[PDB]
Amino acid sequence: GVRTSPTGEKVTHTGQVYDDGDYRKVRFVGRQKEVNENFAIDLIAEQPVSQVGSRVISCDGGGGALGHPRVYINLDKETKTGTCGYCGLQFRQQHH
Amino acid sequence: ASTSVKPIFSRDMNEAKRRVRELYRAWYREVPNTVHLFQLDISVKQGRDKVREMFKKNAHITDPRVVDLLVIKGKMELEETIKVWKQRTHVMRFFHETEAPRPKDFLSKFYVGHDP
Amino acid sequence: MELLQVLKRGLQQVSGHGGLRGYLRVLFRANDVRVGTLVGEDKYGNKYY
Amino acid sequence: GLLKKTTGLVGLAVCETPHERLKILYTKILDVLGHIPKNAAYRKYTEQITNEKLSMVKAEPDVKKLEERLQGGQIEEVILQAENELSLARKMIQWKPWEPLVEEPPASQWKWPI
Amino acid sequence: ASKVKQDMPPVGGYGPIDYKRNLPRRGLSGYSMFAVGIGALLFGYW
Amino acid sequence: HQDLPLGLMDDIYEFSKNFSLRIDELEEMLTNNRIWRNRTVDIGIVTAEDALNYGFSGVMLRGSGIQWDLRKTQPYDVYDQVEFDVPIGSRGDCYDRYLCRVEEMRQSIRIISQCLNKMPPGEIKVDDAKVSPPKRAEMKTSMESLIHHFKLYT
Amino acid sequence: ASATRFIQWLRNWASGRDLQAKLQLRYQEISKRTQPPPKLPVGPSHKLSNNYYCTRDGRREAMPPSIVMSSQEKKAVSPAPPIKRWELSQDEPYL
Amino acid sequence: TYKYVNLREPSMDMKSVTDRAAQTLLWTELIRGLGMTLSYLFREPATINYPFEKGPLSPRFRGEHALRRYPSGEERCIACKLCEAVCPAQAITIEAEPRADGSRRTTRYDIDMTKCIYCGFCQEACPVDAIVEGPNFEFSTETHEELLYNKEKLLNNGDKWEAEIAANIQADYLYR
Amino acid sequence: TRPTVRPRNDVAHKQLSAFGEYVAEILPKYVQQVQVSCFNELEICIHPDGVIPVLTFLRDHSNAQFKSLADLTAVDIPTRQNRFEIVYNLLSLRFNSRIRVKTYTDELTPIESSVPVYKAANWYEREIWDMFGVFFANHPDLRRILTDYGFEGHPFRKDFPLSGYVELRYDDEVKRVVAEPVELAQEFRKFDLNSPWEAFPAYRQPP
Numbered sequence A: 001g002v003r004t005s006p007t008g009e010k011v012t013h014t015g016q017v018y019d020d021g022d023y024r025k026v027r028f029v030g031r032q033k034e035v036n037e038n039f040a041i042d043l044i045a046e047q048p049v050s051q052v053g054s055r056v057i058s059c060d061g062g063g064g065a066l067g068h069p070r071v072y073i074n075l076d077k078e079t080k081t082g083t084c085g086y087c088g089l090q091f092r093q094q095h096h
Numbered sequence B: 001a002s003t004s005v006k007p008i009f010s011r012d013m014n015e016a017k018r019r020v021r022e023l024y025r026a027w028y029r030e031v032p033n034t035v036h037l038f039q040l041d042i043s044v045k046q047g048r049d050k051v052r053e054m055f056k057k058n059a060h061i062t063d064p065r066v067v068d069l070l071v072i073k074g075k076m077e078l079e080e081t082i083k084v085w086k087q088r089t090h091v092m093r094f095f096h097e098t099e100a101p102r103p104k105d106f107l108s109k110f111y112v113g114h115d116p
Numbered sequence C: 001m002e003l004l005q006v007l008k009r010g011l012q013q014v015s016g017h018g019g020l021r022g023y024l025r026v027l028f029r030a031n032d033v034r035v036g037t038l039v040g041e042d043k044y045g046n047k048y049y
Numbered sequence D: 001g002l003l004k005k006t007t008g009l010v011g012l013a014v015c016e017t018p019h020e021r022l023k024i025l026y027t028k029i030l031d032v033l034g035h036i037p038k039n040a041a042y043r044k045y046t047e048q049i050t051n052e053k054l055s056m057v058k059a060e061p062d063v064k065k066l067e068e069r070l071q072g073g074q075i076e077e078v079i080l081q082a083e084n085e086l087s088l089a090r091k092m093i094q095w096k097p098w099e100p101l102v103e104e105p106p107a108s109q110w111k112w113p114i
Numbered sequence E: 001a002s003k004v005k006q007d008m009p010p011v012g013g014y015g016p017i018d019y020k021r022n023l024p025r026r027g028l029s030g031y032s033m034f035a036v037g038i039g040a041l042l043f044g045y046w
Numbered sequence F: 001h002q003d004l005p006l007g008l009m010d011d012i013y014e015f016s017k018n019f020s021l022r023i024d025e026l027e028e029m030l031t032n033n034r035i036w037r038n039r040t041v042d043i044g045i046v047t048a049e050d051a052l053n054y055g056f057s058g059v060m061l062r063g064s065g066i067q068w069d070l071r072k073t074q075p076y077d078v079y080d081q082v083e084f085d086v087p088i089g090s091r092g093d094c095y096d097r098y099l100c101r102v103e104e105m106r107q108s109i110r111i112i113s114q115c116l117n118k119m120p121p122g123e124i125k126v127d128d129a130k131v132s133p134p135k136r137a138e139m140k141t142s143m144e145s146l147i148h149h150f151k152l153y154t
Numbered sequence G: 001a002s003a004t005r006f007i008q009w010l011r012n013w014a015s016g017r018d019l020q021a022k023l024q025l026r027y028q029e030i031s032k033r034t035q036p037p038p039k040l041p042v043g044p045s046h047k048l049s050n051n052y053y054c055t056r057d058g059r060r061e062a063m064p065p066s067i068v069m070s071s072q073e074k075k076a077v078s079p080a081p082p083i084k085r086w087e088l089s090q091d092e093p094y095l
Numbered sequence H: 001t002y003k004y005v006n007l008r009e010p011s012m013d014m015k016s017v018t019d020r021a022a023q024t025l026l027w028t029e030l031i032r033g034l035g036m037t038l039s040y041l042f043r044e045p046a047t048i049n050y051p052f053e054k055g056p057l058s059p060r061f062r063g064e065h066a067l068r069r070y071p072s073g074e075e076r077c078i079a080c081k082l083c084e085a086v087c088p089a090q091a092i093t094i095e096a097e098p099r100a101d102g103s104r105r106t107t108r109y110d111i112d113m114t115k116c117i118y119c120g121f122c123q124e125a126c127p128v129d130a131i132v133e134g135p136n137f138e139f140s141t142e143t144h145e146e147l148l149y150n151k152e153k154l155l156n157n158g159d160k161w162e163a164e165i166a167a168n169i170q171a172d173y174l175y176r
Numbered sequence I: 001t002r003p004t005v006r007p008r009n010d011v012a013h014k015q016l017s018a019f020g021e022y023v024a025e026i027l028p029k030y031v032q033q034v035q036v037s038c039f040n041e042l043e044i045c046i047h048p049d050g051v052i053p054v055l056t057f058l059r060d061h062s063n064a065q066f067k068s069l070a071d072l073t074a075v076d077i078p079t080r081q082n083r084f085e086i087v088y089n090l091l092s093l094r095f096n097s098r099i100r101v102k103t104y105t106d107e108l109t110p111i112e113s114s115v116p117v118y119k120a121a122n123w124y125e126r127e128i129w130d131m132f133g134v135f136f137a138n139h140p141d142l143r144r145i146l147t148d149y150g151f152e153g154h155p156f157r158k159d160f161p162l163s164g165y166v167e168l169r170y171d172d173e174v175k176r177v178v179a180e181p182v183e184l185a186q187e188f189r190k191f192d193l194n195s196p197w198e199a200f201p202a203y204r205q206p207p
C-alpha cells in the first residue's frame, strides 16, 4: 500500500519519491501528487490458491476472448505453486 | 571524359567571377532599401558588412559549377528581400541576436560539456 | 382547435415542473422547460429524463 | 451529312471541310517524312499509320462513318492530332533520334533494390 | 447450431431511393403575370 | 479494419432515402438564382486542350467536355458492377462545374442504393495472416496467430 | 413531427414540396442503439486440409520486372486498343 | 455512360420569350428562393441543448486512453511494448523491470496526449486488453503539462471509467 | 481462382511490351532500358539529354498521345554516382494507358525544363528544386515553393535529418520570432525493424 516518506510525500507503487532536498518537489506546491491507491502487488496476493487435480492446468484469465493468451502451467513441484505469467493467479495440485 | 561535365551558366571560373561581382553589387545597393522597408534596428553599415561576411565564407571555391549554384541561391535570396516576400524575422535571422555567444577555446568548451 | 391544444401544453409544462417556481428554475438553469419521464437519479443528485 | 453544331469540347471549333483538311495535312506529313533517312524507324512507322488513315479518308464520304473507321473521337480531334504529328515530324529532323545511343549509364544506375 | 449473423440487407432488398432532380413547376404564365400587374395599375390610377 | 455493426445499413438507407430532397432545396437557392449565375457563368473558362496540358483532372476536365472518369475507364474494387452516369459540361466555366458536382451527388445516391442491395457476405479482410492481423479470439488460442500478431504490429 | 396542421400547410406551400414525408430529423425509424451479438463468418483459408500456404502465397508470386530492352515489316503498335466511345444514358440524357 | 448538364436550347416562341420577360421584370425565381427560406423558418431546428443533451456516440468511440485491471485487481499490462512499437506518433514511453514478486510489470507508462493522434492502434496491438481508448471526450485542460499522462494518471482513469469501458468492450469484442 | 492472390492480366503485359519495344526502336539515341513490371506498368529509362525529345514524341505521336502529365517527382539514392532519379508519370486518354519515363542527375548537373512540353511541370520542378536541389535549366520561374523563406538545405535528401537543424520560437526581448538550433525534449526513437531472414528469394542479388 501507499506509505509516506519522512517529508510527507507519498510513495508510488513503483517506488518513486523525491528526496528531501530535490528541487523538483516545487511542482507540487499548491497542487497534489497523483498516486493510485490500488497497489496491484497487494491485490493479487489476496487471491486464494486454486486447488486442481491434474499435472497441467490452463489459464486464459477469465472471460474467454476477454482475458489473456491461454497458457498451460506445470504443477509437478510441491515446494512452490504454479503462477500464471499474465494474470498472477496461482494453482496447486491436490496432494499429488 | 570523366572530368567533362555540363555547365550551369559559366564555362570557367573567369566567367563565374563576373556573376559573383554583379550579384554583390545587387546586394550592396539594396541594403539601404531593406533597412528602410523592414524598419530594422541595425544600421546600413552593419547590413553591408553582413553581405561582405556571407560572400567571404565561400571565397575558397574553385569549381565553376558550385559557384553558379551559390549565385543562383543568392539571386533567389535577393528576390525574396526586394519583393518583401520575407518578413522582418527572416531578414534578422542572419544576425543571431537571441543566441548567447558560444566559446571557441578548448578550456571553455571543457567546462560546459562534452562536444569538441 | 389545434391552436388551443398548443396553449394547453404550454400551460401544462408549468404544472409539470411544480408550479411557477420550479418552472422558472429549469428555465434559467437549463434554458428548456420540456417535461419528460423520469428514468432515474444518481447518488450525486443528477436526474435523467 | 448534316454539319454538327458543336464539337462538345471547349475551345475546339467545328470544321466545315473535314475531308479536305485531312488530305492536305496527311500529304504534308508524308512529304516531311521524305527528309528523314530511309531506315529510321520513325519514318517507317509514321508512313505506315499515316497512309492507312489517309486511305480511310479517301474511301468514306460520310463524316459519321469516317469517325467510326478512324477511331479518334470527333473528326475535329483527328484533325488536331494530324497537326501534332506534323509538328512532331518537323522536330525529329533536328533531333535525329535514330542515331546510336549517346552514352551508356554508369554500371549500377538502374539497379533496384540497391 | 448458430447461424452466421452479420449486417445484411433485408430479404428482397431495400425500397427504391429517389435521386433525380425534382424542381417542380409553379405560377402562371408570362401573359397572365403581366395581365394582373397592368390590371392593378389601372385600378390604382382610377 | 472491422465489419459493419448490425443495423448500420438500415440507417444508411433511411439517410439516403431523404438526401435527394436536400439537394433539390440546395438547387432552389442557387441553380436558377440570377445573382448566383452572374457570379459563375463564363468565369474561369478552360479549353479542353489547356486542361489536359496543365495537369487537370476530375470536374476540371469534365466541365470542358472531356469524357474521362477513372471509375469507368480504369476501374478499381467493384466500380465495374454498379451503374452511374458521368456529368459532362459544355462551356467549361464555374457554372458548368457547379452543375457537375451537384449532379455527381445524385449519382452517388444511385451507387449507394446498389451497394446496400448487393452487399455480399463473407470476411472483411484478406484471409492471409502474413498481411492482415488475425482475429483476437484466435490470437489468444493459436500459436501462429500470436506470432503473426506480434510481428505485424512491431 | 409536432408541427400543427396549419404550419405544415404553410411550410409545404412555401417550398412547393411535401416536406413531412422526408423530414430531416430522425424520430423512430433509426436502429436500436442496442443490438444482438453478431457471429461473423470466416474466410476461405479456414480449412483443416488441402490448405498449404505455398499454394496461396501471393507475395511470393511477385517477380522482378522483365527486361524487354537494355543497352548493356513490323506493324505499328499502340499501348492499348483505342478507347471505345461513350454512350448517352437512356436514364436521363439531358439534365 | 454520360449525361449533359447544361446543353439545353431555350425555345424562341412568343409565349416562352414572354415567360422569361416576366421572370426578368417581376423577379419570379428570386421570390421562389425567399419561399424556401420561409419554410425553414417554420421547421423545428436541429440544435441540441448541450451540456444537458449530448450527441450520440457508439461503443467504438475513441477517446481518453486508459489502463485496465483484471477482475482480481492485478494490472493487465505486462510491458510487452507492442503498443509503443505500433504508435505512429511515438506518443508512448515504457520502462519495465521484474516486480518484487517477479512479475513482468512496467515502472513507466507515459502517453503524450499532444503527440497522440487518437488512432486506436495501441488498443489493437495489445494482446491482453490493457491500454484502451475510453468514451470520455471532455478532458480539456488549462495548461500544457496536464496533458502529459503518466502511469498514475492512466491507472486512475481506468479505475474511474471501468464500469463504462467494460460494457463497451462487451458490446464490440465480437467484431474484433 | 485463388481468393487471396491478385489475378494476372497477361493481355496487357503483352501489349505494353510491344509498345516499349516500339518506343526504343524510334529513339535509340536516348533509350537505355525498357522494363515491364509484374503488375503491368511500363518504364522507359532514358539519358537525361532526351527529356524534351522523348516527352515530345510521347505527347504528339499518333500512336502514343500521352497528353496528360500525371506527376513528376524525384527519388534520392545516395549510393549511386547520380543520386537523383527523375520520374515522369504520364497518361493517355486516347488509348487508356499509362507510362513512366525516368532519367538521372546529380547535385551539380542541370536537367532541361519540361514546361514547353507540359505546362503542368512548372510547379513540380520547383518542388523538386526546393526539396532535392536539382536545378532545371530554362525554367520561367524557379524558386522555393514549399519550404520557409531563407530555408537552408533540401529536406527530402536522404542525408537531411528528420527534425532539421533549426527551430522557431518567440523571444520577448526582440519582439519577434527567432530561429535557434534544435533541441528536443524527447529525442526521436530509432527502431531497427528489419528481420535478419530473407523475405523474397525472387529478388535475391548475386553475391
Ligand SMILES: CCCCCCCCCCCCCCCCCC(=O)OC[C@H](COP(=O)(O)OCCN)OC(=O)CCCCCCCCCCCCCCCCC
Pocket: E042, E045, E046
Ligand atoms: C398598344 C396599346 C398600348 C396601351 C394604349 C393605352 C391603353 C388604354 C389607356 C390605359 C392607359 C392609360 C391609363 C389611363 C388610366 C385610366 C383609369 C381607368 O381606366 O378608369 C376609367 C375611368 C372610367 O370612367 P369614370 O370617370 O371613372 O366614371 C365615373 C364618372 N363619374 O375613366 C378614366 O379614368 C378617365 C379616362 C382616361 C383615358 C386616358 C386614356 C385615353 C388615351 C386614348 C385612348 C386610346 C389609347 C391610346 C392609343 C395610342 C397608343 C399608342
Ligand code: SF4
Pocket: H065, H086, H087, H088, H089, H090, H091, H092, H111, H115, H116, H117, H118, H119, H120, H121, H122, H123, H133
Ligand atoms: S491512439 Fe494511436 S497515437 Fe494515440 S497513443 Fe494510442 S496508438 Fe498512439
Ligand code: SF4
Pocket: H076, H077, H078, H079, H080, H081, H082, H083, H084, H094, H122, H125, H126, H127, H128, H129, H130, H131
Ligand atoms: S500492448 Fe498492452 S500489454 Fe503490451 S505494453 Fe502496451 S499496454 Fe502493456
Ligand SMILES: [Zn+2]
Pocket: A059, A060, A061, A068, A084, A085, A086, A087, A088, A089
Ligand atoms: Zn492467467
